[PDB]
Nucleic acid binder design. Structure first.
Ligand SMILES: [Mg+2]
Ligand SMILES: [Zn+2]
Ligand SMILES: [Zn+2]
Ligand SMILES: [Zn+2]
Lengths: 429, 515, 417
RNA sequence: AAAUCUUUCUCAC
RNA sequence: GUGAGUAAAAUUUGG
């Protein structure tokens, strides 16, 4: 009745954060005194009785994981299993339906979890927690062939359409393209135009699935705005046109680029369930979008501005092939529509980034030296460093064209560490 | 038996050391070591490296993360009863609330702006002044840090003032940002495994790998070094105030205040200390005092040693070592090709701290072990079965369960010993969802948290402001009438929907349910 | 949305009403005037005209949707807005000058910066230390570990019996005899009896540590799991004899004797004397009604007892077994004995590690991991990492450290690396 | 008595 | 078992 004055003296108003920080009761700390606390007054026994009487019947049932693939032991690598958060509209609806406001509030935030994994699949599939060894995948077996081919980097059976090879758009596909200032979303049956005012994605029909995908890619809030209209709109022409299909897996948003600031989406395919970037996959992905503008499909450890500065510094002294590789990397790591000067030609070079003796960039846990890339190391010639002159037990002999790893070279009678080997980054030339 | 392991093993299967001894001795040893270093006899605390190349952040707007300023953890609150300073132990939330009440500031951002915009130190901010704030922020309280594996003699940790924490948050956020902008590979926010994986690739280009720890890292980081780093990145008067408080810090040992002119009191500024080294060179992959580097010739090793010395990073001759077939950082060891070293490594056992919480923690540990190459799945399944049997031996008593439902675990009177694979694949009774690592909180966890909310240092009569609109930002200001109205409106809506409390929500199960 | 303008917004509304009573302007900074389930597009919202309004300074754009009406606050005299009504409202409401504070930057120099810098300058500063000379050498050999073990042996010696470690083996008595022996041992020691429980009372303390010696290894420890479970259970139920399948213990709270009025119940800090039984044969033999058994005691504080009781012996042993080399047979003092040794003494060493609340074996394990993974180390400093007798105190920690060093030596001998 | 500055507090209801 | 005070009342013990 008057505890507000006692808790906050001399203040009439306080923030919600401070007020809620005073009544925290959902934090668990594992301590030595756990058993004594649970025993005191049969706290745990009474809690179990209450949970079995009241809480358990309200727990909903969920299905069990069934999808499995064959896995193999592989080098330890970080798997990033991004879990999207509740959308604003869905959160509002759930709250209106009498759901707990605090939990729904906590659920709006997209959460990224990185976990070590030592097993790999033939398609670089992601795995459920603790089931990488058994090969339980986050994806589910597809029904039709087009769904399976859309996600596949190299579809087995082309169908003459953009989903599974070069071609035009089917009825189950859609695209989003930036024309001038407006984002045109074409499904084939319905056409829509969107624009960002300050932080929303203004559109006539925000509920449009392509509109939701575009909002996720651009990191905006869908907002209804009938005033949005466009004049130039060659959506029918591009829909009936044929575009080359890149040999790359889907980006984290579940789309594949087909033109400058243009992406293809499948109605029944959601967020990517396979590893987008890998040692064997990074450079093909970079080459696929060298002239397609920023993508935002790769996470970089550190400041994006610093990574772009190092990329530009390497670009200054590079060759046309290395220059294209660097531009592809810059496009890969740049978020879409966040005012980033990813164009290495138009980016102002700074001299403070040229003083360091090596330019390093970390993409999805992969560390790449841009100076070495300029020297044609990751794609043309492998790097060798001698570890010892003695034969180590348990290590294989040096192959003809070695991939990354430690091998015993009998010709030099020495243990060698191969890194930046085309045999790992450019297996298929 | 850790000695006869075929692979690498740190012997983390048992818990860490613990005891009830007072922290006075450890605090005194730490302060004495810092004082000895200040004399320039044992180690070096004078920073001679060049930090003029660090980017300047003085033009960035001043922002504060409010959530980081409130917690259930402990802190020191300074009061004056009869002209004598009294240091009290209070929850950090309580300490910051008391500070805001004293300064009559709505939020910590308002308080910092007012502190930075007063014409003089003597000007009053509510019931205090910047002079009084600086005087009070230099007081610390000592405590013991137990359960640290490999440290038979427990170390001393320190509780600071809310004002000190308020400035430290800003300086540490900016130091972390500068590190992200400057370091060759950013690793401040990464885990031990990610750091090891990146370090393997970084050091693959050279022969010898130096895995390094520093000795008494906190006691050799002086206020001068912190001020130098903060001035290099443009912290303005905030850095000056923090350095002034650090130089005049006093620790309450038992009943006496002891001056500690040197040191930074056990990792008060981890990011700034790391920047002290990273701002002078880019040949180290480091955080805190744990670093890894590589070299080819003895001259490079001498250069590395000189760089470490000039950065006040005194190499620990006891622990630092050179290797050629493996690398190690943050207790994670990899082969030079980036593969996890065979053996148990840093795998830690799970003690008996509750019937279901122990099983949940064991499941999480085994999932982590099997996801990497540490353990085959069948071994993990056998270990989980064994853990269930021991939990049954320890907890299947009338003191805990008084139940006999078949689907319950054998440790709660049931006849169910769940398979590890079945639990991981959600092929189990709904009661077992909480035991899943990603499942909801366990019954033991909930009861323990509720009980912990009622301790003397945390209990309160304030009515909880729960079940809020997911759209209203938490930075908005409310009064007693505002919270009353909000609660009344929410209760009216729930009653109109024929409910008295909001429906429980679990987002993972909710997603799983969606077709 | 910026809190700087929040107060301004509150002034703009000023109890303006529409539709005969309903509030006209809704402030986006108020938790009660905000429309639930509606994203905010401006500082305030006019319900009658259904339009968002945002306040900006002359030449300072704010991140709001374009359709939002802007009320530019001119620098000198007036307030200009696209809508005339909003301009009039601004003029009438802003009778005074509610100047809004500027944006504070992190590198903001306060008036007292120079004074505080002078004060810091006048305070003590550190002096440059000496640059250390680092010499890299090979890791220590077996001889160094043997020397450390020999130093421990010479300095401290060995006990005649295994003391509480002997409790890891079953004593030749049944449940009733064990309870009888424990109760009569408590009686013979003048332990106070109250409320059906035993209490140990103390008056003065010598204030010096007890004697430290190395515990000889019993043959085996089949009762390690029961022993740890009983240690966990007893402290929460102290004062009474607690049984298991094959052994029993008695935890006696230790409280100060303060005359007629003395502490009757232990709190969260009372220490416990754990009393256990083992086969007779040492100086601790106790006899009653023809029952003979060695009675061994252990003084523990609540944290130590909780730490000891929560360890899982079986799971730890299995995890170690997963990737373990062959364990050699060792003698009673941790020496290699191929002809008369026992391989079950390793279970006893694990039990000793569990009993050691100091967990000194973890430091030895970490240093041995570093030793195995090291190609070069600092001269005379890496070896000293194996000297940990100065950081521990007590028979149990000392024996744990000695047998950890013995295990390191045994590994270096049987399976050289 | 022992793993020896530790084995520890008041008041109202 | 319910609260109030003691440089503290067991989520103790910080970054
Ligand atoms: Mg360290
Ligand atoms: Zn197709
Ligand atoms: Zn169009
Ligand atoms: Zn004896």
């Amino acid at each position: 009745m008057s505890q507000f004055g006692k808790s906050f003296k001399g203040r009439t108003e306080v923030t919600i954060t401070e007020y809620r920080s005073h009544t925290v009761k959902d934090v668990h700390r594992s301590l030595l005194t756990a058993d004594k606390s649970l025993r005191k007054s049969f706290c745990f026994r009474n809690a179990l009785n209450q949970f079995l009487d009241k809480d358990l019947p309200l727990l909903p049932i969920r299905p069990k994981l069934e999808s499995r693939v064959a896995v193999k032991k592989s080098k330890l690598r970080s798997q990033l299993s991004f879990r999207p958060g509740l959308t604003q509209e869905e959160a509002i609806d759930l709250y209106n339906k009498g759901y707990d406001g605090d939990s729904v509030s906590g659920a709006l935030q997209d959460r990224v979890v990185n976990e070590p994994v030592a097993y790999s699949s033939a398609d670089n599939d992601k795995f459920h927690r603790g089931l990488a060894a058994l090969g339980y995948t986050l994806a589910d077996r597809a029904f039709d062939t087009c769904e399976s081919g859309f996600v596949r980097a190299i579809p087995t059976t082309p169908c003459g359409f953009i989903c599974c090879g070069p071609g035009s758009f089917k009825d189950s596909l859609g695209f989003v393209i930036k024309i001038g200032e407006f984002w045109h979303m074409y499904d084939g049956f319905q056409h829509f135009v969107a624009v960002e005012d300050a932080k929303f994605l203004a559109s006539k029909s925000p509920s449009f699935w392509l509109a939701k995908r575009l909002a996720k890619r651009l990191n905006l809030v869908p907002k209804e705005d009938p005033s949005v209209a466009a004049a130039e709109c060659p959506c029918k022409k591009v829909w009936e046109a044929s575009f080359a299909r890149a040999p790359t897996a889907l980006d984290p948003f579940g789309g594949r680029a087909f033109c400058d600031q243009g992406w293809v989406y499948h109605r029944d395919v959601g967020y990517a369930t396979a590893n987008h970037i890998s040692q064997e996959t990074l450079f093909q992905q970079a080459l696929s979008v060298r002239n397609l503008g920023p993508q935002g499909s790769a996470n970089v450890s550190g400041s994006i501005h610093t990574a772009l500065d190092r990329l530009r510094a390497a670009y200054s002294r590079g060759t046309p092939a290395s220059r294209s590789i660097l531009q592809g990397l810059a496009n890969l790591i740049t978020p879409v529509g966040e005012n980033f000067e990813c164009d290495l030609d138009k980016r102002k070079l700074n001299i403070k980034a040229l003083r360091s003796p090596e330019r390093y960039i970390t993409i999805e846990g992969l560390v790449v030296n841009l100076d070495d890339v300029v020297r044609g190391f990751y794609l043309d010639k492998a790097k060798v460093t001698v570890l010892s002159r003695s034969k180590w037990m348990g290590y294989e002999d040096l192959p003809q064209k070695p991939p990354n790893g430690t091998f015993y070279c009998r010709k030099r009678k020495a243990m060698l560490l191969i890194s930046c080997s085309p045999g790992t980054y450019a297996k298929k030339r | 038996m850790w000695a006869f392991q075929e692979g690498v093993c740190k012997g983390n299967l048992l818990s860490g050391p613990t005891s009830m001894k007072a922290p006075d001795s450890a605090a005194r040893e730490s302060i004495d070591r810092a004082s000895e270093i200040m004399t320039g006899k044992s180690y070096n605390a004078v920073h001679t490296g060049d930090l003029s190349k660090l980017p300047n952040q003085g033009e960035s707007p001043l922002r504060i993360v409010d959530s980081d300023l409130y917690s259930e953890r402990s802190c020191c609150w300074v009061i004056e009863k009869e002209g004598r300073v009294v240091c009290k132990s209070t929850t950090l939330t309580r300490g910051m609330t008391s500070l805001l009440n004293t300064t009559k500031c709505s939020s910590p951002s308002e308080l910092i702006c007012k502190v930075l915009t007063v014409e003089s130190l003597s000007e009053k901010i509510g019931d205090t002044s910047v002079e009084e704030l600086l005087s009070h922020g230099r007081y610390f309280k000592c405590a013991l840090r137990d359960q640290e594996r490999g440290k038979p003699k427990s170390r001393a940790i320190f509780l600071s003032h809310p004002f000190f924490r308020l400035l430290s948050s800003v300086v540490e956020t900016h130091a972390r940002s500068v590190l992200s902008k400057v370091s060759a590979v950013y690793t401040a926010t990464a885990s031990a495994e990610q750091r090891a994986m990146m370090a393997a690739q970084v050091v693959e280009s050279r022969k010898h790998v130096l895995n390094g720890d520093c000795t008494k890292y906190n006691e050799a980081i002086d206020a001068d070094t912190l001020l130098k780093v903060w001035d290099a990145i443009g912290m303005g008067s905030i850095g000056v105030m923090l350095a002034y408080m650090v130089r005049r810090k006093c620790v309450l040992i038992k009943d006496t205040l002891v001056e500690c002119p040197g040191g930074m009191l056990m990792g008060m500024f981890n990011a700034t200390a790391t920047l002290a080294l990273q701002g002078t060179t880019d040949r180290f992959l480091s955080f805190s005092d744990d670093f890894i580097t590589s070299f080819n010739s003895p001259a490079e090793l001498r250069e590395i040693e000189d760089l470490l010395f000039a950065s006040c990073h005194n190499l620990s001759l006891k622990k630092s070592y050179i290797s050629v077939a493996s690398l190690e950082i943050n207790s994670c060891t990899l082969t030079r090709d980036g593969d996890l070293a065979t053996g148990l490594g840093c795998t830690a056992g799970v003690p008996f701290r509750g019937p279901l919480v122990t099983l949940k923690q064991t499941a999480a540990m085994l999932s982590g072990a099997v996801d990497s190459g540490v353990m085959p799945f069948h071994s993990a399944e056998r270990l989980f079965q064994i853990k269930q049997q021991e939990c049954a031996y320890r907890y299947n008593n009338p003191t805990y369960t008084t139940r006999n439902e078949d689907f319950l675990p054998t440790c709660l009177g049931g006849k169910t010993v769940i398979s590890f694979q079945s639990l991981l694949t959600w092929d189990c009774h709904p009661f077992w969802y909480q035991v899943h690592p990603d499942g909801p909180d366990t019954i033991d966890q909930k009861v323990l948290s509720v009980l912990a909310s009622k301790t003397r240092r945390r209990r309160t009569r304030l009515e909880a402001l729960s079940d809020l609109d997911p759209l209203v930002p938490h930075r908005l200001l409310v009064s007693e009438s505002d919270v009353s109205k909000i609660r009344a409106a929410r209760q009216a809506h729930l009653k109109s929907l024929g409910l008295e409390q909001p429906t429980n929500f679990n987002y993972a199960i909710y997603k799983a349910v969606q077709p | 949305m910026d809190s700087r303008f929040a107060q301004l917004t509150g002034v703009f509304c000023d109890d303006f009403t529409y539709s005969e009573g309903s509030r006209r302007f809704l402030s986006s900074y108020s938790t009660v005037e905000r429309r639930p389930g509606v994203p905010v597009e401006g500082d305030c919202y006019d319900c009658l005209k259904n339009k968002w309004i945002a306040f900006e300074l002359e030449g300072q754009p704010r991140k709001f949707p374009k359709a939002t009406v802007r009320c530019i606050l001119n620098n000198d005299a007036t307030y200009v807005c696209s809508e005339q009504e909003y301009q009039q409202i601004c003029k009438v409401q802003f009778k005074d000058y509610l100047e809004i504070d500027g944006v504070v930057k992190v590198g903001h120099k306060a008036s007292y910066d120079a004074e505080l810098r002078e004060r810091l300058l006048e305070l003590p500063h550190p002096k440059s230390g000496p640059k250390p000379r680092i010499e890299w050498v090979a890791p220590p050999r077996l001889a160094d570990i043997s020397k450390e073990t020999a130093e421990l042996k010479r300095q401290y010696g060995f006990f005649e019996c295994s003391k509480f470690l002997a409790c890891g083996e079953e004593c030749g008595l049944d449940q009733e005899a064990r309870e009888l022996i424990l109760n009569e041992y408590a009686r013979d020691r003048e332990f106070e009896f109250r409320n059906g429980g035993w209490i140990q009372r103390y008056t003065v303390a010598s204030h010096k540590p007890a004697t430290q010696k190395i515990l000889p290894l019993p043959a085996s420890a089949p009762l390690a799991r029961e022993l740890l479970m009983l240690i966990a259970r007893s402290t929460t139920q102290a004062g009474k004899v607690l049984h298991s399948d094959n052994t029993s213990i008695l935890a006696v709270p230790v409280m100060r004797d303060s005359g007629k009025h003395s502490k009757r119940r232990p709190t969260a800090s009372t220490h416990h004397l754990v009393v256990g039984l083992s086969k007779p044969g040492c100086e601790h033999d106790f006899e009653f009604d023809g029952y003979r058994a060695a009675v061994h005691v252990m003084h523990l504080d609540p944290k130590q007892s909780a730490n000891i009781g929560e360890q899982d012996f079986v799971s730890t042993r299995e995890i170690y077994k997963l990737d373990m080399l062959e364990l050699p047979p060792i003698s009673r003092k941790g020496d290699l004995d191929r002809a008369s040794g026992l391989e079950t003494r390793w279970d006893v060493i694990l039990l000793l590690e569990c009993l050691d609340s100091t967990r000194v074996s973890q430091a030895v394990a970490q240093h041995f991991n570093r030793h195995r993974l090291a190609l070069s180390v600092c001269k005379d400093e890496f070896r000293k990492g194996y000297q940990l007798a100065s950081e521990i105190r007590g028979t149990i920690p000392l024996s744990s450290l000695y047998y950890s060093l013995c295990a390191v030596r045994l590994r270096m001998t049987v399976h050289p690396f």
